[PDB]
């Protein structure tokens, strides 16, 4: 029928894409990096333990100054920490306690958060009176807010369980652009360094590269077996890593348009909740459901170290802009700084 | 001016920690509940008896309860349901094959690794609707549940005086359908509290209070290795 024609027409294109990707796969990354020296044993120690959250922590984000950071807990609080002195700078009560994401504006003047309320709330940190208050509530998503990232003080990109991503104008509060194409809940997004593109991972076991200016999906990446819970751009903007419930991390190249490396082990059978690269991109850090964080050699797919100082599920992790430290959040209501 | 800079930080951190102590007492005093149910299970009427998520507050015997119901969320629950791993109990409302779909959802909730320590308060709703269909006899449960034709009403059953054995055996069979799932696993970390309820019944709020008391009592007994 008419459905069979279009379904087969889509099937012919998937073979053409798979054949074109196979032609470019002349040699694998594991063979090109076979002659480089290994990073050895990476031994990081807990330098700071941030206490004060009442319930499980769902997200965190470093500030561009590599000193301040914001964390979101399902007790209904955003806490901004001074990681150097462990002092709390702000404690923001949330209208909805079921927060699932938080973001720190690059200027440092705003923070955002959202969750099961399907709203991305913007908070002004530089109020004249000195008390943080809601600056804008971004409504329009028909599903929970899973991730948000500021492009600037006026623009922010969000991902939602409604299978779509959106670009918002904070001053007007309207969706400037809506990114559609995913068939499952979008769980995470990561902005390119130049903020021209961004990648998103979803519960359809696929990752998509989006153009911010045009609003279309440039490329779609597959290879994972289950839902993608985390995504992070390589520092050069030409690659990105993903973490999935299939207990594996994978590295994808934009210009090659295919997976380059898989980071897995037989002992690991739990899903990955968060991923982040070191400053040089040599180290790929990943949080796991087994309460531990693994440090992978991004070039050689070998595990280099473990961050095992958490008593519950690691829900988020982040590397500072200067690359000096790594922060880990967990369901044990604590944030730890590793160095 | 190095000392004055760090001095204001310690003073600002002091005001924050003082506020966090007041919020800690309120957060630990409130018992949070997740209300789950089908579109036609009758849970909407129970909220009437007392956006992505709705909130309902009610107090029983000086105890505060915060009940949450999912609003504008897709039917794919495997991600957002993890946010409710720390609730006191999940209130699962079931209209007494829509019944098989509720059994499958209950099995996934009961066996989810993050919900393993979460007890479930099961509301077998639509008991008056269930009674009318059994008295008529047009639609037989045996067609959708073949093991019902060999089912026998348990001895520990406690039916109403004005109830025929056809309705007593029908509602208790549905209860055993869920109890088989709940007693198959758990190893004593969470429990299931089934209740034959109606949307207009006033004991519903009292039933949640009694089950929550039983949940907290068994949690204390577990902390002392007594049960």
């Amino acid at each position, epitope marked *: 029928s008419e459905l069979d024609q279009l*379904r087969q027409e889509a099937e012919q294109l998937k073979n053409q894409i798979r054949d074109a990707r196979k032609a470019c796969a002349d040699a694998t990354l594991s063979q090109i990096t076979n002659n480089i020296d290994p990073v050895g044993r990476i031994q990081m120690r807990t330098r700071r333990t941030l206490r004060g959250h009442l319930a499980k922590i769902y997200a965190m984000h470093w500030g561009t100054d590599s000193r301040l950071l914001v964390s979101a807990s399902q007790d209904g609080k955003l806490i901004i920490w001074d990681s150097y002195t462990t002092n709390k700078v702000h404690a923001i009560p949330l209208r909805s306690s079921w927060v699932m994401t938080c973001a720190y504006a690059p200027s440092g003047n705003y923070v955002a958060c959202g969750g099961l309320d399907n709203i991305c709330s913007i908070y002004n940190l530089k109020t004249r009176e000195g008390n943080v208050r809601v600056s804008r509530e971004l409504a329009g998503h028909t599903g929970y807010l899973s991730c948000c990232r500021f492009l600037d003080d006026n623009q922010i990109v969000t991902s939602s369980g409604d*299978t779509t991503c959106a670009l918002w104008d904070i001053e007007t509060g309207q969706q400037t652009t809506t990114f559609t194409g995913h*068939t*499952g809940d979008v769980m995470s997004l990561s902005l390119a360094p130049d903020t021209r593109l961004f990648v998103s991972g979803a*519960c*359809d*076991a*696929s990752a998509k590269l989006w153009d911010v200016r045009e609003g279309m999906c440039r490329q779609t990446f*597959t*290879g994972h*077996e*289950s*839902d993608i819970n985390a995504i992070c751009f390589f520092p050069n903007g030409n690659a990105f890593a993903t973490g999935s*419930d*299939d*207990a594996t991390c994978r590295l994808f190249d934009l210009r090659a348009d295919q997976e380059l490396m898989t980071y897995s082990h037989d002992n690991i*059978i739990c*899903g990955i909740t968060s991923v982040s690269f070191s400053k040089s991109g040599r180290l790929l850090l990943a949080g796991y459901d087994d309460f531990n964080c693994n440090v992978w050699d991004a070039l050689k797919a070998d595990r280099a170290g473990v961050l095992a100082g958490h008593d519950n599920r690691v829900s988020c992790l982040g590397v500072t802009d200067d690359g000096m430290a790594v922060a880990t959040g967990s369901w044990d209501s604590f944030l730890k700084i590793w160095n | 001016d190095q000392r004055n800079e760090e001095k204001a930080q310690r003073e600002a951190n002091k005001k924050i920690e003082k506020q966090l102590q007041k919020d800690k007492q309120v957060y630990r005093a409130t018992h949070r509940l997740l209300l789950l149910g089908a579109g036609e299970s009758g849970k909407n009427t129970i909220v009437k008896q007392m956006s992505g998520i709705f909130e309902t507050k009610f107090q029983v015997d000086k105890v505060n309860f915060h009940m949450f119901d999912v609003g504008a969320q*897709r*039917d*794919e*629950r*495997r991600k957002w*349901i993890q946010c409710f791993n720390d609730v006191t109990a999940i209130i699962f409302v079931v209209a007494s*094959n829509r019944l*098989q*779909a509720a059994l*499958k959802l209950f*099995d*996934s*909730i*009961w*066996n*989810n*690794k993050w919900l393993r320590d979460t007890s479930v308060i099961l509301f077998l709703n639509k008991q008056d609707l269930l009674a009318e269909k059994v008295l008529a006899g047009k639609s037989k449960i045996e*067609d*959708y*549940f*073949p*093991e019902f034709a060999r089912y026998t009403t348990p001895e520990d059953a406690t039916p109403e005086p004005g109830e025929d054995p056809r309705v007593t055996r029908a509602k208790y069979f549905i209860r055993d359908e869920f109890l088989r799932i709940s007693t198959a*696993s758990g190893d004593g970390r969470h429990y299931c509290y089934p209740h034959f309820t109606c949307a207009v019944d006033t004991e519903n709020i009292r039933r949640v209070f009694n089950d929550c008391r039983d949940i907290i009592q068994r949690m204390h007994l577990r902390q002392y290795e007594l049960l």
Partner: nanobody
């Protein structure tokens, strides 16, 4: 990518037999619990049967107990459904549905209208 492709089905007289096949690819078949679901004309998706990873735990919906037989072959990465004594109410589009996560007892969202890890279905029509 994860791909599920069902085969078999068609027109069969009432009381006949039918065997469905589900060829899986793009994932470790042996690590996932498999399901069969169907959508009757005008009705919503409903769960039919499931089978554990090793094939030890097997369940059925009440309407097909004693008439449907589910089986899997992890070596060939295939899922089977042996339909015997078919009735007109069995007329539906049967889908091969994989549980979302491996090494899990729970199996969420397999009957959702937009579930990703589900095949395109095969039409089974039982009529005289």
């Amino acid at each position: 990518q994860v791909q599920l492709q069902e085969s078999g089905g068609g027109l069969v007289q009432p009381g006949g037999s039918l065997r469905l096949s589900c060829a899986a690819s793009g994932f470790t078949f042996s690590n996932y619990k498999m399901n069969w679901v169907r959508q009757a004309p005008g009705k919503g998706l409903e769960w039919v049967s499931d089978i554990s990873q090793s094939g030890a735990s097997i369940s059925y919906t009440g309407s097909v107990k004693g008439r449907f037989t589910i089986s899997r072959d992890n070596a060939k990465n295939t899922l089977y459904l042996q339909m015997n004594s078919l009735k007109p109410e069995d007329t539906a589009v049967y889908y091969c549905a994989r549980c979302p996560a491996p090494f899990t007892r729970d199996c969420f969202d397999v009957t959702s209208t937009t579930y990703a890890y589900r095949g395109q279905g095969t039409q089974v029509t039982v009529s005289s």
